[PDB]
RNA sequence: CCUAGUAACGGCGAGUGAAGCGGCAACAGCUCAAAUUUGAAAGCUGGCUUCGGCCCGCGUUGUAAUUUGGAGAGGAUGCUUUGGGCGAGGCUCCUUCUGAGUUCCCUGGAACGGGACGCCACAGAGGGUGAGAGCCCCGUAUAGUUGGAAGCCAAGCCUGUGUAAAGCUCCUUCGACGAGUCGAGUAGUUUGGGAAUGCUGCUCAAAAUGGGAGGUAAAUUUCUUCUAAAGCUAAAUACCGGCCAGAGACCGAUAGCGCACAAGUAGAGUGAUCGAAAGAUGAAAAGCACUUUGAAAAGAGGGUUAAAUAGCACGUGAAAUUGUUGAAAGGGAAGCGCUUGUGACCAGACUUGCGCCCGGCGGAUCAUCCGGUGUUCUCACCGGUGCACUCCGCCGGGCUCAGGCCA
RNA sequence: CCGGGACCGAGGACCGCGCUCUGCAAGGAUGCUGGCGUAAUGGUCACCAGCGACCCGUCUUGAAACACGGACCAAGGAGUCAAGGUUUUGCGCGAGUGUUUGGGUGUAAAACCCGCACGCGUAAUGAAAGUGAACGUAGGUGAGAGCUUCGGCGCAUCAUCGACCGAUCCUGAUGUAUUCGGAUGGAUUUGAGUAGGAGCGUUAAGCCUUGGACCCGAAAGAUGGUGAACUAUGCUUGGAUAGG
RNA sequence: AGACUAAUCGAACCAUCUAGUAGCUGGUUACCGCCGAAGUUUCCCUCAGGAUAGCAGUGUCGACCUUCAGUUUUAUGAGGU
RNA sequence: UUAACUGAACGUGGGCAUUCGAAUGUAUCGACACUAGUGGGCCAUUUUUGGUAAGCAGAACUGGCGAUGCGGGAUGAACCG
RNA sequence: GUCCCACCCAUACCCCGCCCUCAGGGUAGAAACGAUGCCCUGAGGAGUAGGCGGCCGUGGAGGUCAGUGACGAAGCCUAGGGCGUGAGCCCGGGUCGAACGGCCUCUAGUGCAGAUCUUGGUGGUAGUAGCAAAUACUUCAAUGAGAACUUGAAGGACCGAAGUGGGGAAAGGUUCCAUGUGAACAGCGGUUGGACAUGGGUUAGUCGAUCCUAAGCCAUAGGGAAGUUCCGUUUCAAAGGGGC
RNA sequence: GCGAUGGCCAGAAAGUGGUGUUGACGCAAUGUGAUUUCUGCCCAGUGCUCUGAAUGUCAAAGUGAAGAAAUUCAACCAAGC
RNA sequence: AUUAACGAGAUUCCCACUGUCCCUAUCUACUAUCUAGCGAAACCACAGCCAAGGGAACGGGCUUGGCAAAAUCAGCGGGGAA
RNA sequence: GUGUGAAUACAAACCAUGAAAGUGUGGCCUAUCGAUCCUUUAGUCCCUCGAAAUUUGAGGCUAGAGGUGCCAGAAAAGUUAC
């Protein structure tokens, strides 16, 4: 029953809403539980980093097209280029994704370099101490400062392009002959008439023959 | 705080400020928007003119990402360059170098033109540009180039 | 968390209402049908056994190895990889032990109260003891210490080895892939799903670059993306029902659960089921010996206690209603407002203060000056010097002024 | 111009207006005297006397009503909470604003610190494809607080005439994938627009909506269970009723 | 005979949905100070009820704007009791 | 718009106070924001409709009760002060 | 009926005192001030429904009074006092026995005469209505504190074999017998009791259950139903028992 | 009304039931109400029942034509009317 | 449309009989009544003498008059719009 | 000072009549009529079917018609003497 100048209300409160209300009084209690689980997990993995390596990926929509972020895993072609066996990759902290493809060459080159330098920073202890092997560390450089996050030490360096650039005068280019505004209008109407123009031209060829 | 509210001042006065003849019954007039066309029409036409009816054609499965293009006027263009570099250009110490502004990196797609521009050449890279905005930037010595 | 009260549905009325992207928590991948071991069913339940094995049976209408689309098979080619046994040390559980006053005086039935003097403190959380206790007692904080049981993790060492099995780089060629299913028509239900989103009944019923999807029905021609009709798997999420624990600006016996008590009890109904009321003597029963009146219940003395104005009808004991004693009023109601009178009872205020003159007593110390210190820098304090017409306290006499109530 | 009577005494150094001018009746009372210093004055309670006075709460044009509820006492007993709006008051920052989904840390449900995204605001208009805000010192005229070298410049706001952007209806230049393109100039049209930004978070009050919604109250409707020990009908098996 | 079916029958009894809805009756708890009403207009299956305008309160800002008036005088129009 | 710078609106400049051109008052100027109650009324002077008439039914201007005590009508919501 | 003198009293009019509201002024080279203070001047006060402002109390939380108390805290009674217009605050006397206040902020299950309100308790009516069907009682002695309704004897009566007699089925569950007894119950009394307290009492080859079937109920073979389960009792079944 | 392949009736369904251990002198459904003497006229209306040459009306499926298809248009056509 | 027998069915008349009536009178048993013992309930704003007036148009309470003397027992059915 | 009905005065086009000035936006004036949703026709040659084209079909924008007489506009027969 409206009485004055009001905004028309729409409050979805006619079911039995009181039976399903979820108050959050355990927000600080839950936080303590997670911190106890992380430090417990870090103790089990004594020299290993907690996280796993991820590749660089671009967002899939025209909006957010500019920014980049972390993905799920490296494609099978990226691993082959860097000379890493498929089966050995998951067991040394590398994450693999078998359902992604490299359509372009810009993305392929960026990820290969990001994965190649990780292999140089890796220290690999031998399976049995008394008998080391060829690919193992020769025990001389096993003592060095290590990292444990691997998400901050290997995060995205810069997601967006630089804000601006400064260039000397007389280097500024010349625009399109017609202009910027007219280049868009011509390109829009060309796609609208792509069908009408093609058939009109084509039927003329059979008409003359 | 309930210690200071009008319900505390009503103690000792029968009917609690709701009147004697009209006794504040349960639901006179109906619940919600009842009577929109019958007995609440007078209120619903003095205010809210246009509640009833159909207008326009419908769109199935609209995705709002296809229609993303925020716009920026031309008089705010110089605010994009950092302050330290900005004062050098306006004061007039460079005299041989021009800035290249990337609208997409700041979150814009269309460059509208509304105000005035000082006479310093610039380079603007935008996805869209208006007809009036292209002229003003061009007569200042600059150029606009589409970037996609 | 946001998208979002948005696209959409709706006597387009009242109303209803998702998803893609984006940030974060937590992260882990895999095995079957379709191939001839065919130069050797290479596989398994059961019984007996000295523990080495044997026997029957299931099974060729298919039991192991090999392959699962990310591939793979079949060929080339050179390198590389793979078993067992010890094991310090660390972490979980239970159990041994832990600092300081009963010092002195007063009130009290009893100090745990008041005053004086002490000590401990990684311990001043909480409870008991005849009243508010850090030092009377149990406990509390800190790392160690006595003894015992079973699982984990793991620094680093000691020994076999290619019959076998595994990884990588390239290729002419091969490359098997789930049917009364998918899909279509019709009917009912449901959804934001709109010429029909999912599900189920009936009729018809496929294919091999084939098939599904691309949110408007249909025909022709292109394009993008996955591989259905077989199967497994930790974590981030829900919950006070079960067994425990720690807490609160929550309630304080008509409150809080129906139940602080022999409460789902006593009780009602043929039955399904309905379902109450009820906490407190005192620090300690020390719960009244003995005499006397009475048939007895009980009464009067006399006792215990700080108190019986605490006596098992017991802490404190209000109102409605009642008894005795004292005062007063009453010719068909009582109560009440304004203003006197009589009688009873009662709070205030007043009972001196200041000043001057004369007389008496007692003391150190008024003006002035010198030294030290402080401070608002010109105003003060302390020590010394004074030494009786000065200064101060008390007493006696005289005088002026003011001070209570009614006129 | 001379008598008689009643009620009252506010203020608290001087200042003023004046006169009959060693002074005064002129901006508010002082002087003399007596009795008593306690139940005397005064206050409380009970009673008699003069005058006045219908039982409260509620609905109603009208209640003391032959309108309803009320024998008496003690304890209990009724506009609350959450989400979403709106105007006004206080506070922080300000073309920006908001730490707490989450992470770091801690004397541990407290306190302190950090950042990527995201929400509202900064740009509107059409059903839609779309397009998108300066002729002028951001305009002219009449009023405007305040300032001023006195000539003038003129905030906020009110009225009025114009300019620009989107929609609707006309006009159709240069050009040309010869059917595309849409310059320029108009029109008793139209918008929740531009014309030197005002918003975001939080605190308190009034009001609104759905929720048990200020408290107590129907005659009904639906889901699942228990009864033939009374009474109704029937079946198998038994019993009982002088003398004319 | 609308009779009887456990003192219940023109549709038995028990628990739950359920604190079922009410434009209709009843009640709604301390004091002082200042201001102070309406039963009328239009629409509604509306007439014991709502929305809308009116009367009322509070919070203010612009000036102290010299503006105004349930009134009289003077000049000039309309009316059919 | 007119045969026509002939008209029409809006303008620049200039002239006219020695008295800004009827009375009285100004114990109350303008604008905006949010919201409560009410929407059953009744009585009286004059005018007035239906009815034999009514403490009956229905209207116009203004004053009252409702929402209000006090002094008169012995008593009496509306009469006189 | 008309005219003329004097006189009586409203919360109305005039003058004065005091309270509150509103409006207009004064107060710093501060010898100054709950500046929210103080001083001077003028006008006004009726009110239901309703609006706003200021204050007083109750249960809890933070800060502060270096607050009160077993030499007596809280609570309760009191025709005993003081303050405020008012809600209320403070003190004196009596009883009692362990905790409790003032001031500024925060918070709410925060103030009662009514609702045929909820639970508990108590009055007038009132020593009143009443304790009247089934024919009926009397003399002596014993026990005992106490005898119409205990016991013995002797008189008078009733039930009058379809009984107020002698035994059973259903149902009840110790009500049966003995000894003893304060209160309560036996609508008067009580030495008596189906009440209270302490003990005791129910023996079967022959009397019943146990055996057989009736109306009727339920398993098995099978068929329905998502299912709790419905039908089916010789039915479309490989269904048994006798001797050495 | 009915000769068992049946009439009346129960059940969510069933290899399920009642009448039925039944067969027209029987089972099932209605009206009048001993005996005596009688029981008239009306088939327009509303019901019940019978006979299909009649083509009038006419569903899904099926048949024919046009179209690139979705689709549209024609005959034929059960019971009932 | 008639109808023998039957009926705790509805109606009218005649004989016998009578306290139904003119018109009332008397007797008996158990209560009511008094005493000893025991001992409730409905109901209740406060209460309880009238005449007229006005008023919500029928007052116990208001106005003007009549009047008015403690405490009590057995009956009664006008009023308390019981 | 919302809607519906009806009415008055101009502006920009195209016409009728009259020699011309002029008159004409239905009947000399005061009554003679109708929302949302849905269906249907006229108009431009216009926009969309959201992976890209071409023709059917469907959906949009502006103006009329199909109607609510309870006429600011629900889809609606009786009885109760239980």
Query: Do residues B125 and B135 make contact, with C-beta atoms less than 8 angstroms apart?
Result: no
Which chain A residues touch B43 with a CB distance below 8 Å? 2-3
Buried b (16+ CB within 10 A) or exposed e, A3-28: eeeeeeeeeeeeeeeeeeeeeeeeee
What lies within 8 Å, CB to CB, of B6 at 6+ separation is B17
Residue B16 to residue A206: CA distance in whole angstroms: 94
Tokens encoding B17? 């400020």
> Rounded to an integer, what is the distance from CA A85 to the centroid of its chain?
23
> What is the distance in angstroms measured between the alpha-carbon CA of A148 and the sugar C1' of C118?
59
CB–CB contact B105 A1 (8 Å): no
Residue A102 to residue A80: CA distance in whole angstroms: 13
Residue B100 to residue A168: CA distance in whole angstroms: 10
Tokens encoding B28? 């006179």
Please name the residue of chain B whose CA is at the shortest distance from the CA of residue A3.
B43
Please name the residue of chain A whose CA is at the shortest distance from the CA of residue B65.
A63
CB–CB contact B40 A61 (8 Å): no
User: How far does the CA of residue B13 sit from the closest CA of chain A (Å)?
Assistant: 27
CB–CB contact A165 B100 (8 Å): yes
Residue B108 to residue B110: CA distance in whole angstroms: 6
A60 close to B (CB below 8 A): no
Which element (helix H / strand E) includes B123? Answer: strand B123-126
Phi and psi at residue A36, to the nearest 5°? -70, -30
Tokens encoding A13? 């409160």
What lies within 8 Å, CB to CB, of A75 at 6+ separation is A97, A98, A100, A101, A102
User: Quick one: B144 exposed, middle or buried, by C-beta within 10 A (0-12, 13-18, 19+)?
Assistant: buried
Residue B37, CB, less than 7 Å from strand J? yes
Please name the residue of chain A whose CA is at the shortest distance from the CA of residue B121.
A169
With helix as H, strand as E and coil as C, how does chain A read?
A: CCCCCCCCCCCCCCCCHHHCCCCCCCHHHHHHHHHHHHHHHHHHCCCCCCCCECCEEECCCCCCCCCEEECCCECHHHHHHCCCCCCCHHHHCECECCCCCCCCCHHHHHHHHHHHHHHHCCCCCCCCCCCCCCCCCCCCCCCCCCCCCCCCCCCCCCCCCCCEEEEECCCCCCCCCCCHHHHHHHHHHHHHCHHHHHHHHHHHHHHHC
Residue A60 to residue A45: CA distance in whole angstroms: 35
CB–CB contact B34 A162 (8 Å): no
Pairs of residues, one from chain A and one from chain B, whose beta carbons lie less than 8 Å apart: 89
> What is the distance in angstroms measured between the alpha-carbon CA of A147 and the sugar C1' of C272?
73
């Amino acid at each position: 029953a409206i009485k004055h100048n009001q905004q028309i209300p729409n409050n979805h409160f006619r079911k039995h809403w009181q039976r399903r209300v979820r108050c959050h009084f355990d927000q600080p209690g839950k936080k303590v539980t997670r911190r106890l689980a992380r430090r417990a997990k870090a103790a089990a993995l004594a020299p290993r980093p907690v996280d796993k390596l991820r590749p660089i990926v671009r967002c899939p929509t025209v909006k957010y097209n500019r920014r980049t972020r972390l993905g799920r895993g490296f494609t099978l072609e990226e691993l082959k280029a860097a000379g890493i066996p498929r089966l050995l990759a998951p067991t040394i902290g590398i994450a693999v994704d078998h359902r992604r493809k490299n359509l372009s060459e810009e993305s392929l080159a960026a990820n290969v370099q990001r994965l190649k330098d990780y292999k140089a920073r890796l220290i690999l202890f031998p399976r049995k101490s008394n008998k080391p092997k060829k690919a193992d560390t020769p025990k001389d450089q096993q003592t060095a400062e290590t990292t444990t996050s691997l998400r901050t030490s290997f995060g995205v360096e810069q997601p967006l392009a630089p804000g601006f650039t400064e260039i000397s005068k007389s280097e500024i280019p010349a625009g399109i002959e017609g202009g910027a505004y007219r280049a868009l209008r011509k390109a829009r109407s060309d796609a609208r008439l792509v069908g009408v123009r093609e058939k009109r031209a084509k039927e003329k060829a059979e008409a003359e023959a | 705080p309930t210690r200071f509210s009008k319900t505390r001042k009503h103690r000792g006065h029968v009917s609690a400020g709701k009147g004697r003849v009209g006794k504040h019954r349960k639901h006179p007039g109906g619940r919600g928007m009842a009577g929109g066309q019958h007995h609440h029409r007078t209120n619903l036409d003095k205010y809210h003119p246009g509640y009833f009816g159909k207008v326009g054609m419908r769109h199935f499965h609209l995705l709002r990402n296809h229609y993303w293009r925020p716009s920026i006027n031309i008089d705010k263009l110089w605010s994009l360059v950092p302050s330290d570099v900005r004062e050098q250009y306006l004061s007039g110490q460079k005299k041989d170098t021009a800035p290249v502004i990337d609208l997409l990196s700041h979150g814009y797609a269309k460059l509208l033109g509304k105000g005035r521009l000082p006479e310093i050449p610039v380079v603007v890279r935008a996805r869209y540009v208006s007809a009036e905005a292209e002229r003003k930037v061009k007569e200042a010595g600059g150029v606009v180039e589409l970037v996609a």
